[PDB]
Design a protein around this ligand. Structure first.
Ligand SMILES: [Zn+2]
Ligand SMILES: [Zn+2]
Ligand SMILES: [Zn+2]
Ligand SMILES: [Zn+2]
Length: 276
């Protein structure tokens, strides 16, 4: 279920958080991460910790952590405000941001930004200050393992404040899925949806004069835009799949067709369209 009303009170919103696929501003975009496209949701993710945030929040035990929780809660609220007429898109976007918050905290998020580079260093310094003589986490990896449940509660409390939803959810194991795969999947959820809709539209108009020709022209523009992105992301997918025993023999289309339950990608709307 949703978390108790008590737990939610302990979290707070941040007015900093208000409401395409980018092939740059990724670390090592020409080497390790060639082919990686950053989701628009990630580019817009509400979480920034500055040297100055570190200075203020470190002064009281637990405040820096709560500052993180607050951002996570605001990110969730924002996402449900964006996807207000669609519960499940909202849920999946929250999950994706939750996982992204994980990589940021753990210091291996792919975006080349100060927040992505610096958050781990600030968290770990604070944990040294307060936990160096007890049994509590002193590194960000253990912190995440021990506190990810709290982070998720803050997101659900956030999601509920958008429009008093009573339908919360768990996060599956989303945060354990390699980030490049999650981004590829999220691309998948947008594109396979476009693809199914665009096909129906094309068939309907062209195969029940100029409207057909006009429809096909737009269908082509959509196709070429996504085809470049498909091509880029397949480079990363194919380079890195060798390291995972259960996808190493799968093509990029097979990955999204067979191993992305949120995707709705099919042979007809993905494989037949994008892979010749
Ligand atoms: Zn759901
Ligand atoms: Zn969205
Ligand atoms: Zn750089
Ligand atoms: Zn908790």
């Amino acid at each position: 279920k949703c978390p108790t009303e008590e737990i939610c009170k302990d979290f707070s919103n941040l007015p900093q958080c208000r409401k395409n696929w980018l092939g740059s501003s990724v670390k090592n975009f020409s080497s390790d991460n060639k082919g990686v496209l950053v989701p628009p949701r990630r580019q817009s993710l509400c979480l920034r910790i500055t040297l100055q945030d570190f200075r203020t929040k470190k002064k009281k035990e637990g405040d820096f952590e709560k500052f993180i929780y607050s951002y996570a809660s605001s990110e969730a609220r924002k996402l449900r405000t964006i996807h207000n007429n669609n519960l499940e898109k909202a849920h999946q976007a929250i999950r994706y941001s939750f996982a992204d918050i994980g990589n940021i905290i753990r210091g291996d998020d792919m975006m080349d930004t100060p927040t992505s580079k610096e958050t781990i260093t600030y968290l770990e310094k604070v944990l040294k200050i307060y936990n160096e003589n007890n049994d509590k986490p002193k590194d960000a990896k253990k912190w995440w393992t021990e506190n990810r449940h709290h982070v998720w509660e803050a997101m659900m409390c956030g999601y509920q404040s958008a429009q008093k939803d009573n339908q919360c959810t768990g996060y599956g194991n989303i945060d354990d899925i390699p980030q490049f795969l999650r981004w590829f999947r999220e691309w998948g959820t947008y594109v396979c949806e476009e693809s199914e809709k665009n096909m129906n539209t094309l068939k309907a108009v062209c195969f029940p004069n100029e409207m057909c020709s006009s429809t096909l022209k737009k269908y082509e523009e959509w196709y070429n835009k996504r085809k470049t992105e498909w091509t880029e992301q397949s480079i990363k997918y194919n380079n890195d799949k060798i390291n995972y025993t259960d996808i190493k023999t799968l093509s990029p289309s097979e990955y999204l067709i067979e191993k992305c339950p949120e995707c709705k990608c099919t042979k007809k709307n993905l494989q037949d369209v994008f892979e010749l």
